[PDB]
Amino acid sequence: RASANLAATKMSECVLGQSKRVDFCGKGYHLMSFPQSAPHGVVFLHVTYVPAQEKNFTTAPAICHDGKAHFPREGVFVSNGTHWFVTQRNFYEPQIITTDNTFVSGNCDVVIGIVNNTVYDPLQPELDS
Amino acid sequence: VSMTKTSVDCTMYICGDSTECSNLLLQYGSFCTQLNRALTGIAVEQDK
């Protein structure tokens, strides 16, 4: 009965939805689950997302631009050695640092590990032309 | 969430006021103590 309650919970939270519980439905970031009837039991085919190929990058908590601290709206600041990019956490998709993906939260004196870089303003080129 | 918090007096159940029955129960060991301990554990568990 405990096993069947667990099976019902897994059906509800992984077949009927996507569960954020870690290692509840498969090892990895759970995507789906498919029930399969079995003799006196049930089999779940837990479809999970597993990152594969890592790559080292230099990172900073914030970006000091124009005398103010810029933090990533969603992602992390990474550098390939010379240029700084903002990248989503779970997949390497470098993006140019702009004001759309970053938010200002003060000055640079207080953040530990902040680095000096430029933040592109998507309004200045239109203002010039 | 919980169930009825019953308790059973093993000596009073097996035997009434009888003392010969009480002695014959005494020679059977500590079964009554185990039963009372289990029921008390159930009671405390219901409160918990």
Partner: protein, 88 residues
């Protein structure tokens, strides 16, 4: 009290564990995954000529994450894996 049961093989097979002593299995100083749990961290397996080997089971492949207050590791590729889970 018959010699067929008592076999020691010069005493090399005799191995003293914490769960007792294992007789008839050769001790190996390297580690694999647990196959037959003897107890107290000792597991036995049938591996090559071929004989029962008693060993301290390996908890896993030792790893050392290259921690640094400045470096991060971001995956550039993924893997859609399907795991099978069986429940009565």
């Amino acid at each position: 009290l018959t010699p067929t049961w008592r076999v020691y093989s010069t005493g090399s097979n005799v191995f003293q564990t914490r769960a007792g002593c294992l007789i008839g299995a050769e001790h190996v100083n390297n580690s694999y995954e647990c196959d037959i749990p003897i107890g107290a961290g000792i597991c036995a397996s049938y591996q090559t000529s071929q004989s029962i080997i008693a060993y301290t089971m390996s908890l896993g492949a030792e790893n050392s994450v290259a921690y640094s207050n400045n470096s991060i590791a971001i995956p550039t590729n993924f893997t859609i894996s399907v795991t099978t889970e069986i429940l009565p």
